[PDB]
Amino acid sequence: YNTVSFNLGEAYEYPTFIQDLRNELAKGTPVCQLPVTLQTIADDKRFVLVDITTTSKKTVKVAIDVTDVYVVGYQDKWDGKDRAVFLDKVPTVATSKLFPGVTNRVTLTFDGSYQKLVNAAKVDRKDLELGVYKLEFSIEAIHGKTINGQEIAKFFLIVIQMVSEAARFKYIETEVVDRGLYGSFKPNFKVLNLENNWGDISDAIHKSSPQCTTINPALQLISPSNDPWVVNKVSQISPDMGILKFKS
Numbered sequence: 001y002n003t004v005s006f007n008l009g010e011a012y013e014y015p016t017f018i019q020d021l022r023n024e025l026a027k028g029t030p031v032c033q034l035p036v037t038l039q040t041i042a043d044d045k046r047f048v049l050v051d052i053t054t055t056s057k058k059t060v061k062v063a064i065d066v067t068d069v070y071v072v073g074y075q076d077k078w079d080g081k082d083r084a085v086f087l088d089k090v091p092t093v094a095t096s097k098l099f100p101g102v103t104n105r106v107t108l109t110f111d112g113s114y115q116k117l118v119n120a121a122k123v124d125r126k127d128l129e130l131g132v133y134k135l136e137f138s139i140e141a142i143h144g145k146t147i148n149g150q151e152i153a154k155f156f157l158i159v160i161q162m163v164s165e166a167a168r169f170k171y172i173e174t175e176v177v178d179r180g181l182y183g184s185f186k187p188n189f190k191v192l193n194l195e196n197n198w199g200d201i202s203d204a205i206h207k208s209s210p211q212c213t214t215i216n217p218a219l220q221l222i223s224p225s226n227d228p229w230v231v232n233k234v235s236q237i238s239p240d241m242g243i244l245k246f247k248s
Contacts, residue, residue, distance in 0.1 A: 071159065
């Protein structure tokens, strides 16, 4: 599997990092001049690894399913040896082929859906601060430490939004660049709305192809200020898209 890296002490490299990740995910046929993921792929090319290193020199290798950009787990350290930590309900190929040879393998009691993650973290997305420093703090809280479901759920919530969602949405990538590289921020109404509708937005754009203009039925989205944002044209939403989900 290929690896893309990001050092939290070099926040300015974030835009390049996200673009390199999109390059690894863009394996499908483009639609309306936008990258698209593949629904199925050989097990040997099923995942991309994201190496995140803190200023404290600790690294966590996060595994992402290239078909849907889902984080399935990560590898950190425990007692000087590697440790594989997996979310519940991930593909069998994930637990069978990722981090080969690592015997300390943990299967968490919760899956990667936002509902299960927030329930375990005990904090909702709207109240959890994102940013390079916050991400490093969450890594420091779990790296080389006994398995604590609550702390690990917080790490997943932060990394999933700063990496996976940013790859999917240029809008989210820009929020992190403007507010989370040299500061901290809580995701606004639009960030959260896009996260909840990646699949639907992608299917809508696919349905509009090949004329790539009209989107009908319209997408009922939300603006940064929590106001209704009705999208019936590709040009209205294409600027916020990084990569679309597979289909048609």
